[model samples]
Target chain A: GPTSPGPALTDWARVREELASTGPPVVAMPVVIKTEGPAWTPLEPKLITRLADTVRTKGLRSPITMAEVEALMSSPLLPHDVTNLMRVILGPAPYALWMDAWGVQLQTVIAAATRDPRHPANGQGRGERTNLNRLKGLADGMVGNPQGQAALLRPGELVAITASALQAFREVARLA
Target chain B: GPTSPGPALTDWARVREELASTGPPVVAMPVVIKTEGPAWTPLEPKLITRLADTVRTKGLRSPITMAEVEALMSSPLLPHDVTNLMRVILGPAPYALWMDAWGVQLQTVIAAATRDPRHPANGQGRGERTNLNRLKGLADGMVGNPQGQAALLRPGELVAITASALQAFREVARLA
Candidate 1:
């Protein structure tokens, strides 16, 4: 039996060669397909059916080889989808994350910007830039909002999350 | 006549010196004092007075210098607190600007959870790791959420915001 997940072959060079034969997808595809059927049984059946449909309709047709998928699915615990997993492992935009969170909190303030209560900005046409700008403003506040200061303040949860997420990405890179 | 809003001197050494003199609280204090006034004004008197009150009431009196206090009042645009800012910037975390933005979005989700009655997962609790894990789950849905993943996936905006935020931090660190 394979000792663990990822390319089963011990030698990465050989694995690369095998993956080369099947296209890069084989190198990246899951070796197993752990279904949520048991654990997620309580989830909406429609959702489950939709997911199943995706697997049957789209997943099976993926460019990765069957052997890799089989290997991924055989594991006792469900494995993540390598691509999406890679993306998560990679982390999202730190600046945006901070800004959007800040922006959402500011949404009410924005909504109340008008006395008429029907201003275009009041209706949610408010752009993502509004949030981004708010975040930038918040960043400015972090540094005492210098005359023109707009950098992200350091040593905060945003930095911590960024660091942790990056660490996770490094681990994923090693796995991939 | 500098093209940018940043300090005249962009060199690390000069920037560092300027930041050191001003301190973090001084950097964004001006902006904070500007906008938050109209909002928090009715709640108190002058915005800066209210801020000072928060500092006293919240017990943020010690460890922060008068210079820092000046900075806080000068801009006052930040959404996160001084402690939170320090936590993000000083921590040895692997944060890309983009990834940080994703974390921010997750913060919004957590905030929403506080008001939501439909989801048990709401009000999940604090802790950087816990929030991040929640974000990882949320990311699975974020890209497809249709509200738009502009915050998460927009490459150009991510790069630009990141660059600016970093520049600001660089300036702050220089000062520190």
Candidate 2:
């Protein structure tokens, strides 16, 4: 119809046919966080669906990327809080996947960065190797040794702790 | 004056002292399964030290290795039990380190193994890619999701679930 409030002469059946031509809105891949057993509780499926709907409607201005994640890791925020943020941004599933991926990647990056001369914390001196290993040991102790006892943390928390450790290493390795 | 114990010498201290001189017997690394976090507990430190002592005294005819871990993943035995065995073997510290390393390495291996034509599950045919991704998805889902929840699982139980999923992938990959 030509008029905004008042409809101009138009066939209602033709309008209905035109509207029906477009299929249902496309749902993006569902971001489901993987787990050990039973992928999700009964309620989670509905929750995830709603989450997807929100993402679709809100539309992310800047999609998540590895670089951004790295930046987040480098930041001084608490690991637990940071992890919660990650869950919101990436959804449970993708967040889980990315957290593991990032854990491995960041470890590799810190190892290399510490050794690289271009970085502020160049580990070229005689004691540096030992220092590097010690740093790794401290981080490993925090993350690994306490395994079974602590309540299972979000993948983001693990990443956060590991990231904080990495930052600590950078601080230590910095040139005086 | 060294006298060979002629089956009559009940004193074990001499034997122990002699063995002690060989240095704190080299403890083979423990074989704990890798998980998301807090690999062990406070009590585990004492437990690990004792485990090392036992290994030093018992003398393993065969030591655990990455290859063995891979084999175990291929086996149908529950991942949780296998992971528990790993914890016992590796102790908390080495177990933690190895777990993360394996997580990254296995993903890489599975990714490559799926694509290589020499392997049985080569993705040359139609639906093979789907099959491969599905397998990967299963493994990823096992290890990746359910980050913050699952407190209900015993430490070993979580590991078992993950190992079972890994075995499922290996079954599909047919690269044995």
Candidate 3:
């Protein structure tokens, strides 16, 4: 009979060692976001302030123009961080709508950042990097017309986005 | 002279290539916390529930005993996520206190996870890994009896903690 402490009290080192030996090598993976435009400009302070207020009040509305959306995409801020901030300011439904509208630009930013070695977002550990890439992919699918892009995301993609959003939120909330 | 678009509009690829060639390789590093006793048991649900409540209301208080602290240290949850949850539940000051109290444990968990080859936290590029190890070293010095341990952290240590916490938070948030 194998008599031992409960699973919770078992030697985690042993379990981890076994898991390490059996699991695949964790390697950094690339986040790919396909795009068809040049880099974008910074958003005006007024726009950012207005957007912030809108996020808190009416929720995120689609930008009037692609350029307005691109301001957000090309802003120095991380896309997921931007998304998480929206989650805090706007509720989940609005955040989803916001993502639907801007996800394409977000995907473009993520792809560019991933490809750029100079970007701080690059070269993270496998799990962290992989999750970022996964988020990037989800955003990538949501690119193009908001209404159509929202439809493009399948149930699985939506689930993934939700889970990852929660994870990103937790991370941001901790450091916020 | 390199002629190009303004900083915001520059071609990121050229910059990224230059950065990659000059910068150190990004790597995963260990986060360590040395423990004097045997492995800890899981926290009771009632205790966890109580702690959750406390975190929401009064923020995290110092554990009465090493065992209580160890329970937090050894929990399966990621530190940044835990911190983020606390931020949502507790306000800023308490969150800071919570980090001060449990940072060592969090560092330990991070170190262990980073070292486990099968763990997704492991196998990052070299530079990033080295930075994590350096932070771990700084944290290792600050672990001890809570009240006294907080005092042991120097200005530099505090800055390092803040910076690393932000970096870790960003990494976690991006992945989340």
Listed models, DockQ each: 0.01, 0.04, 0.03
Runs with alpha carbons beyond 4 Å of true place in candidate 1: A1-176, B1-152
Off by over 4 Å in 3: A1-46, A52-66, A88-91, A97-130, A133-176, B1-176
lDDT of 2 by residue, B1-176 (tens): 22353311112233333333433422111212233433212112233233334443454322333334354444222232334434444445545554554455445545554566343323344433322222222332223322222222233333333554444333322322
Reference-based lDDT, residue A7, model 1: 21
> Comparing candidate 1 with candidate 2, which one achieves the higher lDDT?
2
Model 2 stretches astray by more than 4 angstroms:
A1-176, B1-56, B59-78, B117-176
Instruction: Give Cα distance to truth, residue A156, candidate 2, Å.
Output: 30
Candidate 2 displacement at residue A62 in angstroms: 60
Error of 3 at A175 (Å): 32
**Candidate chain B TM-scores, in order:** 0.19, 0.31, 0.27
Better candidate number, 2 or 3, judged by DockQ: 2
lDDT by residue (B1-176, candidate 1, tens digit) is: 33144422121232223333543421211111221111100011133233333433443323443344444423221111221232222323322332454355545545544555333333222411123332332332122221112212222222222233333343343334
Write the residue-wise lDDT of candidate 1 on A93-124 in tens digits: 32234333434543443444334344322323
Q: How well is candidate 1 docked (DockQ)?
A: 0.01
lDDT of 3 at A170: 35
